[PDB]
Design a protein around this ligand. Structure first.
Ligand code: SF4
Lengths: 180, 160, 427, 353, 95, 166, 117
């Protein structure tokens, strides 16, 4: 029984297709078939300048958007060999790890729902909204934020981003624990 | 009687015709479920209530599911698979069917007796004392049969 | 009890069989039967009820036989699941129960108890052996419906569900006719015989042994309690003895030949039922059981699969003792005096003649001469030029059994007045 | 009923008709409430518009459901496709009218039951087997073999738990010595609520009526997120509403039986008043299941099978023998109390430390 | 009295079944209708001679069920590997 | 019978359907994850019958095409649309879907209107959750028959008779 | 006996239920426009069927079913004892236990061997 777990449905994840070679009770093989979102970054980016490219890097991954951005930024900075002032690298780690938390939260939120029943999704999301709101303050927008501009970030940290960050740093320990 | 009686016995027989004529296993088997309901009703009407309820529970609720599972399991889209030298034998078969009723019919106009005893409605209260009374042996025989069936059944299907 | 040993061992052994090795379960099951046999001997002639179960003259004799057959068949086979003993054990119990009752519902329950494990035992998965299995199950299941329908009209004609109570006009006549059908099929009285040629060919040899002894015993046992009309009997016998013996000339596959033979012997045995007896059938079946038991042990020693007629030839070279055994057997089933087979025939025939049914008894005898074609067709073929075919000689185990059977056979030939005294029908 | 009143047939019809439309409207406004009680659990607000408070949101839903294209796909059994929802709903509906809610002579000159039989429990047991007919037929009916394979998963599972229900009701049946719901109720009036003398039968029953589609098996399946649940997935307009419906009417029916049998009908040592206390016992178990529903995962059909088949039934028959012994030697009922009390203690120390 | 005639009719029908069908499982299905014909008969008479014909009937059910289980089981194991259930396409054992 | 007739009745039915819209989501990329956002927690959505998690096309009816949609994916999505019962609407969320976003390529299918008729567009990359609420309000008031646009013309409530299905 | 009064009444209940059922189904059936397609007609997403019409399924389903039938017969019999159980005394209890152990012996065998293949 080679079964066709189709585009998304009926297990409602991604757009992966898996040809499950199944005896009946015993999983033998999955033949994965990909190619359902090949929208070709590798081509497209060859027709846009370097400033513009910083806006195509968070459009690939998205659960962890900023990491692509960060990774790309570094690669260029390195290439033409010009420093990053120290505060820049500080801001960049604060955001980088903040986006990382954002990603894990969405990962555990979806997973638990995926198989398992409903509830743990919402708490994992609840916290995620707060992170996105924090992000909102500093870069002007949610995920798919463009804030690196080679050599550093493009605006200061506002006055208000540090107070609100403090709020969220108090809560998170207790909050993580309830997922455990 | 014969106002209502007619209805139930007509239904029963009619249903009977269906389960042996029709094409396709599922419609067939399903007809037999309508059968066993009617028959259950007829039990109740004849002061055997307990037996009635068991008719539904076992024969129509356990058994036919097993039937359905087999005909689903191995498919069945023809009640008339292949063609083979058996074709003329349809009328001799239908002949003999009449015959086997005929001789039995004859027999039953041969002792005709009173229908006139009580039964208590057949409630399981009043069946109990008999069942574990002197029929207790017969019962344990039953019990042995089931166990044998399970073990046999396994040995056929799974290698092991 | 006898029942006690069987039931206990069977249930206990059921779960037990996981721990023990398959040889050890063959060891266990052999012991069990033998104990059951022990208990039979030491309680002989004390009729004992404890329920609908009722040990009497008939029971004792035929369950001796049923147990006998079961001991033998369990001997020969090496399995791959403990279950191909376990199911046989069960089956033995079923046949024990069949004889030792007289109440119709026990009889039904018994009929499934003996028939069910037989269907499964028809499988060593040989492709033929599935075709075989199926035929038997469907024909069996048909007879299930008949025998059950028979009982239901019987209860109509009489207050009893036990066999015994006056009997009436037409309905009682009717009811008794449909009961002979069911039982008939199990003993292979024609014209229900149809499965007996296919299943005997299809099933693996040791199994066929079991059917050709035990089921015939058991079947007859219960049959005897039926007060069968003298007309019914006469029909059955004629059809059995004619179709059986004539058709058997045409066959040329050893087991299937013996299948046809095993219709004929049922036909002769059913004569005994006229006045009813339990001494006549006791003796008869004793000689039949031994002879067939012997014979099929020998066929197994040839090969596990369909034995072409020629395969028998040269048996005397291969081993002398075994070759002679099979000879003695074949003459015994033909009934050439002074062998025990003759006495078995004679006693049955004597009950027919007392009953005064002449014609039947003549017909039977004429075609019983016919029977010599194929019986000698085996028995002499033994001595000719040795064949180049598969064979093996088996242990001293098997030698002792086969040769025991053949001496025991002709021993009862000369001295039937040993056993006959104490095959009493009352105790 | 050898000692209870009977109904006039016209009035049977009225009470029957009422119990049907009552259970539709029941189901409707319960679904809304189920959404909302979940919502709060998952720190949210459910339907809140479609005013005046959500109360017309079910209306909107129902009206939506019809007035859509019902279509039978090519490759489907014509007859069954139409039949299959009917069958599933009929066998859900029946046996709510069996169970009494108030005491006799208090439905304004009439009785608070549709029927009351003289073989109560058997009828109950019987309808629980027949729902599963609806299920597997739909499977074949849909004519997608994907649906079929799902439906067998379903059916197989359901049927496994079905056996435990039989052994479950035996424990109170011994004690009451009759098997009619009313008698079971009156028995409890004197002697004690039946969850006392048969704590392990409360348990095994509870979770076994639970196992009917009610989440925590759930490789029942529902289509989403697995090798699909069959039956639906190929049905569109009205028929679909019915399956979904059925599953909820079953849910509420089960939420009623557990009070009726095990904690008294409406008997109390605080007040008997007809309808109310029953509705409250219902209310509790209803609400209890939704809390369960939210906060735990789902099982595989592997596990599920081990659990009922392998585990529950050895506890079910074990309890049967004990209670049958106790009654056989005709002993005090104190002796069941001690054991019950002990089993509750066993299962308590084992879970809670 | 009606009932006892009816019973024989249902028996007759089943026979017509048993001989006609070309799918094996439906043969077996036909057999079951005959078996219930039996239980009806038995039960009809149970009303005449009072109350043992009930207990009788129940025992029959259990036997019937046993023979169903094993029998369909057999049908399954034979034709799981075979891809057609054609009964008269089993024919090598023959005279 | 076919469809609906009488002023009274249609106003009834139109309320019934309109206020109950049931989303079958067709996640496809980054657009999807923000669509999930719109369900949980702080953000609203559960107030228009969308509360239950529906995700077979059969069991729901407004298809939210959320994300980039490859050339290879067009026949799949096409088929998914076709397998919906008769009143079926497409909100097209996000730029990649609506027009092609910033990808103008061999690969990506520019302007979702190829694979189905659109009904309500909601621009953004992603448009934040609240914008999707606004979209469904639009689609709500569209189906009510109050579907006029700047050119003074009203669009017929269901547009999916606008195009064909086969 | 037991009064026939309520059994007729049962049938009444069934008659009500079926009516309301079928009525609803005819309401549903008639309303809502019609317009066939080319992939509404030809079954679900990826393949002709989304199991793509594979042949034969595990014997598991047979096993579970088979178990259930035999044991449902078990349950059937334990009801007569269950109702009137104080009438039969100690000899009663010995009978029941006997029967049960036979069927439980069945249980342990098919359990140790495998419900799973
Ligand atoms: S429009 Fe933007 S948010 Fe959407 S799929 Fe495209 S890149 Fe993602």
């Amino acid at each position: 029984m080679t079964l066709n777990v189709g585009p998304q449905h009926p297990s409602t994840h991604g757009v992966l297709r898996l040809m499950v070679t199944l005896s009946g009770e015993e999983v033998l093989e999955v033949v994965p078939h990909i190619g359902y979102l090949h929208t070709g970054f590798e081509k497209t980016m060859e027709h846009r300048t370097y400033l513009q490219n910083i806006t195509y890097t968070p459009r690939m991954d998205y659960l962890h958007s900023f990491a692509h951005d960060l990774a790309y930024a570094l690669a260029v900075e390195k290439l033409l060999g010009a420093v990053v002032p120290p505060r820049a690298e500080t801001i960049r780690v604060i955001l980088n790890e903040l986006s990382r938390l954002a990603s894990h939260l969405v990962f555990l939120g979806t997973g638990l729902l995926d198989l398992g029943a409903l509830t743990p999704f919402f708490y994992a999301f609840r916290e995620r909204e707060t992170i996105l709101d924090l992000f909102e303050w500093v870069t002007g927008q949610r995920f798919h934020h463009n804030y690196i501009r080679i050599g550093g970030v493009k605006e200061d940290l506002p006055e208000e981003f540090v107070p609100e960050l403090k709020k969220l740093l108090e809560v998170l320990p207790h909050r993580i624990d309830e997922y455990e | 009687m014969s106002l209502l009686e007619g209805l139930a016995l007509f239904l029963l027989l009619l249903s009977g015709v269906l389960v042996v004529t029709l094409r396709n296993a599922i419609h067939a088997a399903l007809a037999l479920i309508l059968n066993f309901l009617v028959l259950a009703g007829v039990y109740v009407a004849l002061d055997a209530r307990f037996l009635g309820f068991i008719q539904v529970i076992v024969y129509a609720g356990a058994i036919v599911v097993l039937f359905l599972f087999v005909i689903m399991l191995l498919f069945a889209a023809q009640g008339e698979i292949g063609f083979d030298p058996l074709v003329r034998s349809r009328p001799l078969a239908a002949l003999l069917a009449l015959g086997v009723a005929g001789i039995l019919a004859a027999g039953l106009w041969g002792l005709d007796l009173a229908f006139t005893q009580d039964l208590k409605g057949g409630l399981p209260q009043a069946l109990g004392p008999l069942l574990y009374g002197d029929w207790l042996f017969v019962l344990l025989a039953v019990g042995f049969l089931l166990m044998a069936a399970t073990v046999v059944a396994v040995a056929l299907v799974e290698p092991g | 009890m006898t029942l006690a040993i069987l039931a206990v061992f069977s249930v206990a052994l059921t779960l037990l069989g996981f721990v023990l090795p398959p040889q050890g379960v063959k060891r266990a099951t052999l012991l069990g039967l033998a104990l059951a046999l022990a208990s039979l001997l030491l309680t002989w002639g004390k009729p004992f009820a404890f329920g609908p179960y009722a040990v009497d003259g008939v029971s004792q004799v035929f369950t001796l036989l049923a147990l006998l057959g079961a001991l033998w068949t369990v001997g020969l086979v090496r399995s791959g699941r403990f279950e191909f003993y376990l199911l046989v054990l069960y089956a033995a119990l079923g046949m024990h129960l069949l004889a030792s009752t007289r109440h119709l519902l026990l009889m039904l329950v018994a009929l499934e108890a003996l028939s069910l494990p037989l269907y499964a035992l028809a499988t060593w998965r040989r492709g033929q052996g599935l075709e075989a299995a199926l035929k038997y199950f469907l024909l069996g299941a048909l007879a299930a419906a008949f025998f059950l329908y028979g009982a239901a009209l019987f209860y109509g004609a009489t207050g009893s569900l036990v066999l015994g109570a006056p009997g009436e006009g037409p309905l009682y006549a009717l009811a008794l006719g449909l009961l002979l059908v069911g039982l008939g099929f199990k003993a292979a009285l024609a014209p229900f015989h149809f499965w007996t040629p296919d299943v005997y060919q299809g099933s693996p040899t040791p199994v066929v042994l079991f059917m050709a002894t035990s089921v015939k015993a058991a079947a007859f046992a219960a049959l005897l309690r039926v007060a069968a009309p003298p007309e019914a009997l006469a029909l059955l016998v004629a059809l059995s003895v004619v179709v059986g013996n004539l058709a058997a000339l045409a066959q040329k596959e050893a087991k299937r030949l013996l299948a046809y033979s095993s219709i004929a012997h049922a036909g002769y045995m059913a004569l005994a039922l006229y006045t009813g007896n339990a001494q006549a059938l006791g003796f008869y079946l004793l000689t039949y059981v031994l002879a067939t038991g012997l014979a099929f042990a020998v066929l197994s020693q040839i090969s596990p699969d369909r034995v072409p007629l020629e395969a028998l030839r040269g048996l005397y070279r291969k081993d002398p003792l075994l070759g002679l055994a099979f000879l003695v057997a074949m003459l015994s089933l033909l009934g050439l005096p002074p062998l025990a087979g003759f006495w078995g025939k004679y006693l049955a025939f004597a009950e027919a003649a007392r009953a005064g049914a002449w014609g039947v008894l003549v017909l039977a005898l004429v075609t019983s001469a016919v029977s010599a074609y194929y019986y000698l067709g085996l028995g002499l073929a033994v001595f000719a030029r040795p064949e180049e075919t598969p064979f093996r000689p088996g242990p001293p185990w098997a030698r002792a059994a086969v040769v025991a059977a053949g001496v025991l056979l002709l021993a009862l030939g000369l001295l039937p007045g040993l056993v006959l005294p104490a095959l009493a029908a009352g105790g | 009923t050898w000692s209870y009143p009977v109904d006039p047939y016209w009035m049977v019809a009225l009470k029957a008709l009422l119990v049907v439309v009552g259970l539709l409207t029941a189901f409707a406004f319960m679904t809304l409430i189920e959404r909302r009680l979940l919502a709060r659990f998952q720190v949210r607000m459910g339907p809140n518009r479609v005013g005046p408070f959500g109360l017309l949101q079910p209306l909107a839903d129902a009206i939506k459901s019809i007035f859509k294209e019902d279509i039978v796909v090519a490759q489907a059994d014509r007859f069954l496709f139409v039949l299959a929802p009917l069958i599933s709903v009929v066998f859900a509906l029946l046996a709510f009218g069996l169970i009494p809610f108030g005491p006799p002579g208090s439905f304004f000159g009439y009785q608070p039951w549709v029927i009351n039989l003289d073989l109560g429990i058997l009828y109950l047991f019987a309808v629980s087997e027949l729902a599963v007919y609806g299920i597997f037929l739909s499977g074949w009916a849909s004519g997608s073999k994907y649906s079929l394979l799902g439906s067998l998963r379903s059916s197989a599972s359901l049927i496994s738990y079905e056996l435990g229900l039989g052994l479950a009701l035996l424990a109170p049946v011994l004690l009451v010595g009759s098997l009619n719901l009313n008698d079971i109720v009156n028995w409890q009036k004197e002697h004690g609520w039946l969850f006392l003398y048969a704590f392990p039968a409360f348990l095994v029953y509870l979770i076994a009526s639970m196992a009917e589609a009610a989440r925590t098996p759930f490789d029942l399946p529902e289509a989403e997120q697995e090798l699909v649940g069959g039956y639906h997935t190929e049905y569109s307009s009205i028929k679909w509403a019915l399956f979904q419906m059925a599953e909820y009417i079953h849910f509420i029916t089960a939420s009623a039986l557990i009070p009726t049998l095990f904690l008294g009908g409406w008997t109390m040592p605080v007040l008997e008043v007809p309808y109310l206390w029953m509705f409250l016992k219902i209310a509790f178990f209803l609400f209890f299941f939704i809390w369960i529903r939210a906060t735990w995962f789902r099982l595989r059909y592997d596990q599920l099978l081990r659990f009922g088949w392998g585990f529950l039934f050895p506890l079910a028959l074990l309890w049967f023998l004990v209670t049958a012994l106790v009654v056989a030697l005709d002993l005090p009922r104190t002796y069941l109390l001690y054991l019950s009390a002990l089993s509750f203690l066993v299962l308590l120390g084992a879970v809670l430390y | 009295m009606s009932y006892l005639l009816t019973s024989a009719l249902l028996f007759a029908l089943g026979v017509y079944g048993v001989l006609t069908r070309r799918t094996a499982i439906l043969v077996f299905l036909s057999i079951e209708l005959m078996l219930n014909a039996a239980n009806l008969s038995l039960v009809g008479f149970a009303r005449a001679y009072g109350l043992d014909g009930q207990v009788a009937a129940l025992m029959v059910i259990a036997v019937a069920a046993a023979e169903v289980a094993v029998g369909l089981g057999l049908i399954v194991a034979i034709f799981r590997h075979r891809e057609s259930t054609a009964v008269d396409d089993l024919s090598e054992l023959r005279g | 019978r076919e469809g609906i007739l009488f002023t009274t009745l249609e106003k009834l039915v139109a309320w019934g359907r309109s206020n109950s819209l049931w989303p079958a989501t067709f996640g496809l990329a980054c657009c999807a994850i923000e669509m999930m956002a719109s369900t949980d927690a702080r953000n609203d959505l559960a107030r228009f019958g969308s509360e239950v998690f529906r995700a077979s096309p059969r069991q729901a009816d407004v298809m939210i095409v959320a994300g980039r949609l490859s050339k290879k994916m067009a026949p799949v999505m096409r088929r998914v649309w076709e397998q919906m019962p008769d009143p079926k609407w497409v909100i097209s969320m996000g730029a990649c879907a609506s027009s092609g976003g910033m990808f103008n390529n061999y690969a990506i299918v520019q302007n979702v209107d190829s694979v189905v008729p659109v009904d309500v567009y909601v621009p953004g990359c992603p448009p934040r959750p609240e914008a999707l609420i606004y979209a469904v309000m639009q689609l709500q008031k569209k189906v009510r028959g109050q579907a006029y646009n700047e050119r003074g013309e009203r669009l017929p409530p269901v547009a999916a008779w606008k195009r064909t299905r086969g | 006996m037991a009064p026939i009064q309520e059994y007729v009444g049962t049938l009444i209940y069934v008659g009500v239920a079926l009516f309301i059922g079928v009525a609803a189904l005819l309401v549903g059936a008639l309303l809502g426009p019609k317009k066939p397609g080319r992939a509404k007609l030809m079954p679900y997403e990826s393949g002709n069927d989304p199991a793509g019409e594979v042949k034969r399924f595990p014997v598991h389903f047979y096993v579970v079913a088979m178990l259930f039938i035999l044991f449902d017969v078990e349950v059937a019999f334990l009801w007569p004892y269950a109702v009137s159980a104080g009438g039969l005394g100690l000899y009663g209890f010995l009978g029941v236990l006997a029967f049960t152990l036979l069927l439980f012996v069945g249980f342990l065998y098919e359990w140790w061997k495998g419900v799973m293949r």
